Scaffold this motif. Sequence first.
Motif, PDB file in Angstrom:
ATOM      1  N   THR A  66       1.004  -1.331   0.106  1.00  0.00           N
ATOM      2  CA  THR A  66      -0.116   0.003   0.105  1.00  0.00           C
ATOM      3  C   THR A  66       0.825   1.107   0.027  1.00  0.00           C
ATOM      4  O   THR A  66       1.982   1.282   0.875  1.00  0.00           O
ATOM      5  CB  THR A  66      -1.020  -0.034   1.211  1.00  0.00           C
ATOM      6  OG1 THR A  66      -1.834  -1.174   1.225  1.00  0.00           O
ATOM      7  CG2 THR A  66      -1.949   1.219   1.081  1.00  0.00           C
ATOM      8  N   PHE A 125       1.874   5.450  -0.020  1.00  0.00           N
ATOM      9  CA  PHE A 125       1.479   6.467   0.498  1.00  0.00           C
ATOM     10  C   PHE A 125       2.378   7.953  -0.106  1.00  0.00           C
ATOM     11  O   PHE A 125       3.448   7.682   0.079  1.00  0.00           O
ATOM     12  CB  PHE A 125       1.543   6.807   2.008  1.00  0.00           C
ATOM     13  CG  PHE A 125       0.725   5.737   2.776  1.00  0.00           C
ATOM     14  CD1 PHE A 125      -0.621   6.364   3.589  1.00  0.00           C
ATOM     15  CD2 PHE A 125       0.678   4.316   2.848  1.00  0.00           C
ATOM     16  CE1 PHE A 125      -1.339   5.450   4.375  1.00  0.00           C
ATOM     17  CE2 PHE A 125       0.038   3.441   3.501  1.00  0.00           C
ATOM     18  CZ  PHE A 125      -1.258   3.980   4.268  1.00  0.00           C
ATOM     19  N   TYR A 140       7.645   9.479   1.489  1.00  0.00           N
ATOM     20  CA  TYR A 140       6.866   8.313   0.940  1.00  0.00           C
ATOM     21  C   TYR A 140       6.785   7.351   1.991  1.00  0.00           C
ATOM     22  O   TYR A 140       7.540   7.040   2.738  1.00  0.00           O
ATOM     23  CB  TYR A 140       7.418   7.934  -0.245  1.00  0.00           C
ATOM     24  CG  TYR A 140       7.830   9.147  -1.427  1.00  0.00           C
ATOM     25  CD1 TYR A 140       6.780   8.994  -2.532  1.00  0.00           C
ATOM     26  CD2 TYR A 140       8.807   9.688  -1.370  1.00  0.00           C
ATOM     27  CE1 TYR A 140       7.073   9.909  -3.538  1.00  0.00           C
ATOM     28  CE2 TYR A 140       9.062  10.455  -2.345  1.00  0.00           C
ATOM     29  CZ  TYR A 140       8.208  10.638  -3.423  1.00  0.00           C
ATOM     30  OH  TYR A 140       8.349  11.549  -4.687  1.00  0.00           O
ATOM     31  N   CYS A 143       5.950   3.167   2.642  1.00  0.00           N
ATOM     32  CA  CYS A 143       5.256   1.784   2.169  1.00  0.00           C
ATOM     33  C   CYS A 143       5.013   0.941   3.201  1.00  0.00           C
ATOM     34  O   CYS A 143       5.822   0.622   4.039  1.00  0.00           O
ATOM     35  CB  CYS A 143       6.513   1.460   1.218  1.00  0.00           C
ATOM     36  SG  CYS A 143       6.111  -0.104   0.263  1.00  0.00           S
ATOM     37  N   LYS A 175      -2.608   9.427   3.389  1.00  0.00           N
ATOM     38  CA  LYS A 175      -3.863   8.472   3.246  1.00  0.00           C
ATOM     39  C   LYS A 175      -3.729   7.651   1.999  1.00  0.00           C
ATOM     40  O   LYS A 175      -3.160   7.975   1.093  1.00  0.00           O
ATOM     41  CB  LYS A 175      -5.086   9.162   3.166  1.00  0.00           C
ATOM     42  CG  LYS A 175      -5.441  10.105   4.440  1.00  0.00           C
ATOM     43  CD  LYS A 175      -6.461  11.108   4.296  1.00  0.00           C
ATOM     44  CE  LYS A 175      -6.496  11.963   5.665  1.00  0.00           C
ATOM     45  NZ  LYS A 175      -7.864  12.795   5.732  1.00  0.00           N
ATOM     46  N   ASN A 176      -4.344   6.504   2.230  1.00  0.00           N
ATOM     47  CA  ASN A 176      -4.430   5.590   1.197  1.00  0.00           C
ATOM     48  C   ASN A 176      -5.976   4.703   1.558  1.00  0.00           C
ATOM     49  O   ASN A 176      -5.916   3.971   2.482  1.00  0.00           O
ATOM     50  CB  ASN A 176      -3.372   4.677   0.764  1.00  0.00           C
ATOM     51  CG  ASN A 176      -3.687   3.925  -0.616  1.00  0.00           C
ATOM     52  OD1 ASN A 176      -4.720   3.613  -0.764  1.00  0.00           O
ATOM     53  ND2 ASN A 176      -2.571   3.840  -1.534  1.00  0.00           N
ATOM     54  N   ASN A 223      -6.732   3.604   5.052  1.00  0.00           N
ATOM     55  CA  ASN A 223      -5.600   3.866   5.786  1.00  0.00           C
ATOM     56  C   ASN A 223      -4.906   5.164   5.872  1.00  0.00           C
ATOM     57  O   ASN A 223      -5.166   5.928   4.946  1.00  0.00           O
ATOM     58  CB  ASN A 223      -4.215   2.942   5.068  1.00  0.00           C
ATOM     59  CG  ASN A 223      -4.533   1.634   4.795  1.00  0.00           C
ATOM     60  OD1 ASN A 223      -4.359   0.839   5.638  1.00  0.00           O
ATOM     61  ND2 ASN A 223      -5.098   1.262   3.461  1.00  0.00           N
TER      62      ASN A 223
END
Lengths: 222, 202
Positions: free
Chosen positions: A121, A123, A138, A140, B129-130, B133
């Motif tokens: 995922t 960011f 960043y 991860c 954010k994602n 998340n």
Amino acid sequence: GTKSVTRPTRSSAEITCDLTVINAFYIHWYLHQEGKAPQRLLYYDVSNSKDVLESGLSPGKYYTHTPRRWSWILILRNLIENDSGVYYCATWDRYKKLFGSGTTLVVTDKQLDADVSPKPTIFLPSIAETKLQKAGTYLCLLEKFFPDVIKIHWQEKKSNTILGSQEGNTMKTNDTYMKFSWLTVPEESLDKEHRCIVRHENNKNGVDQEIIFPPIKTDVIT
Amino acid sequence: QKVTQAQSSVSMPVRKAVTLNCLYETSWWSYYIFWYKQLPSKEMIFLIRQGSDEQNAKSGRYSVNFKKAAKSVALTISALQLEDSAKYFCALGDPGGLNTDKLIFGKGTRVTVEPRSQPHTKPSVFVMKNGTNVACLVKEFYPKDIRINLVSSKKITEFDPAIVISPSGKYNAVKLGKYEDSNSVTCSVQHDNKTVHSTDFE
Ligand SMILES: *[C@@H]1O[C@H](CO)[C@@H](O[C@@H]2O[C@H](CO)[C@@H](O)[C@H](O)[C@H]2NC(C)=O)[C@H](O)[C@H]1NC(C)=O
Ligand code: NA
Ligand code: NA
């Protein structure tokens, strides 16, 4: 060279020797279990091609294979849960005894999903951080992986220089684990794409994962 | 033969020094003592060797205070660096030096190298954010004591924050969670009698 080997009980496991030895005569095998003292289990006589077991161990349980000259593999039979831990190959002098990188053996019967590879995922930096600090972070996130043995590092797209990243501890999530890593890059490098490289036993095709972080692109607010 | 490392963990600041004790019992007349460093990646690195018939071992920032009467082999790590943070193992040769000889190890002692005493530093606070998340990023703070709160009325899951030493010798922190109301999630941090909101920077 920190690997993991995950196997079910009652199967066999192979543990590879990481040391590059010239003129070895005895190859020693050590077991390190969490909270216990590392201890030798056996040694291999290179000249006579024989294993010398510590008192109390059953013959046939451990076997040192030589697939090629000056290359060694420890084969364990009839795995049990208590066989789990870090295995090391060792020899005297380069007199000091030197150890290989060590392999984490994980023995489990746990019924896990077919995909226990780290799931990524990404960011991207907040607008507030790039504006105010002329740097972007960043992040991860790697989830639902098994076993816990993992390595994450960062590089630029057409560069093999390891970047200065930071990481959290691995955290257990039900029967699996999660871990995250972050990289702060200056404004001048925000226009470059970045790679989060994850090394894990259960990655697709046993090759490490390369997660691409797209470059920051300028946006006009209309 | 037995090897005992009484201390389980020890903490000292950078540039200072730490001493790791070790006591052993051996029937052998002449022997060898070795000190190893185990990395969190599980690598076993040789540091220093001490002989039965030798003086006191010294190799860079490492030294061994040997006392064959009491059978004590304390290791001292001088002018501590942040990468000295590891698990240190004391090993007794059986007797040592011969190619077939085993090492008898201790259970090991963890060393944590603390950052130096410094002026108090207020952090900057950002949210990334994602989907569901939400990550709260807390940059450059001193002291370590902090409460990080992700403001949500529909929390799915929350993880323990990760606190790490920053390249400038202060602290950085990341707190992650999953929130149903993620698009409106904000972050608040309590540190050194002040409250820093992520909205302060927006
Ligand atoms: C949220 O996380 C996912 C997973 O990393 C992101 O989706 C990936 O984005 C890259 C491009 O950089 C693609 O090559 C991948 O195929 C995507 N992977 C999946 C599983 O969808 C996504 O972009 C992130 N979203 C935000 C807003 O940062
Ligand atoms: Na051989
Ligand atoms: Na065992």
